[PDB]
Amino acid sequence: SPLLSTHNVTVLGNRSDPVVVLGHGLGTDQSVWKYTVPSLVNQNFQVVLYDTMGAGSTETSDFNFKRYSSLQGHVDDLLAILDELEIENCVYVGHSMSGMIGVLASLERPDLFRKLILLSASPRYLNDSSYYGGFEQEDLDQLFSSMRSNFSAWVSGFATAAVGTDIHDEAVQEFSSTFISMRPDVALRTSQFVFQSDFRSILSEVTVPCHIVQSRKDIAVPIEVAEYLRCNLGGWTSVDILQTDGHLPQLSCPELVVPVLLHCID
């Protein structure tokens, strides 16, 4: 119960319906799923939402920086939640950095996951020999500098670029508000690990089926990254490309994302 309160765990739907767990990316929280969850409930799925430790909706006064210096602490948090909810098996939908969390958790407890759905996920953001992840180390250095120097100004610029088209004219402010509610040092240290991570070599270890979903244009996830995960995840894979631009399409263009997410879960 303290574990479930600590992560703001929310369970919606019928107790006997198939379970879908939804993880969120850096800078947002479970409210990123605000336009997705009611469709999942009305489709007779049981929806588990949670906030990763360090999110603005999470209590972080004595944040355990050591435990959360890699994704291992978040993976252990996610595993502890599934056990505390007595979930023997689930579909896991991971947005952005929660994509790798689900991959890593499935490597530790593959029995727990029928299926992974990676939304805007990337195993490595830095370019490499014949790998385009979208970023060079100089971009990251400048990115981190701007985060430390003026976090609010960095958030405003990053949120407009990450959200992309904002037709309903609310997602930039929504994403900006959850990002600015974070502790800047939690955001910095999480970004430093995530943007410089490289999980490419463990992809072949994945055994659970993976649906790969991402926008056609995403400043943080080149389309080449979706093809790369398709060819390098060790299990069954499929790619659905959303006819949108943006890193949080479930928030900014849910009408084009929800049908795809419904198909992938079922």
For residue 160, report the phi and psi dihedrals to the nearest 5 degrees: -65, -40
Residue with tokens 């929504």: 174
Q: Which of 96, 98, 106, 120 is catalytic?
A: 96
218 part of the active site: yes
CA distance 129 to 260: 33
**Fold that domain 1-266 belongs to in CATH:** Rossmann fold (3.40.50)
DSSP-based three-state secondary structure for 44: coil
- The tokens describing 183, both together, are 């502790």
**87 Cβ neighbours under 8 A, 6+ residues apart:** 19, 21, 48, 112
Residue with tokens 């500098």: 145
Asked whether 264 and 117 are in contact (CB, 8 A), the reply is yes
Q: Give burial (CB, 10 Å; 0-12/13-18/19+) of 21.
A: buried
- What experimental approach yielded this model? X-ray
- The tokens describing 246, both together, are 């943006």
Q: Which of 24, 31, 218, 252 is catalytic?
A: 218
CA distance 68 to 75: 10
DSSP-based three-state secondary structure for 152: helix
Question: Quick one: which of 226, 222, 246 has its CA closest to 238?
Answer: 226
Torsion-angle region of 111 (φ positive above 0: left; ψ -120 to 50: alpha; else: beta): alpha
Which residue ranges make up each domain of the chain? 1-266
Q: Which of 74, 98, 247, 252 is catalytic?
A: 247
DSSP-based three-state secondary structure for 155: helix
96 part of the active site: yes
247 part of the active site: yes
CA distance 108 to 106: 5
Asked whether 210 and 118 are in contact (CB, 8 A), the reply is yes
Residue with tokens 């909810």: 85
What is the distance of C-alpha 25 from the center of its chain? 4
Strands in 173-221 per DSSP E: 210-217
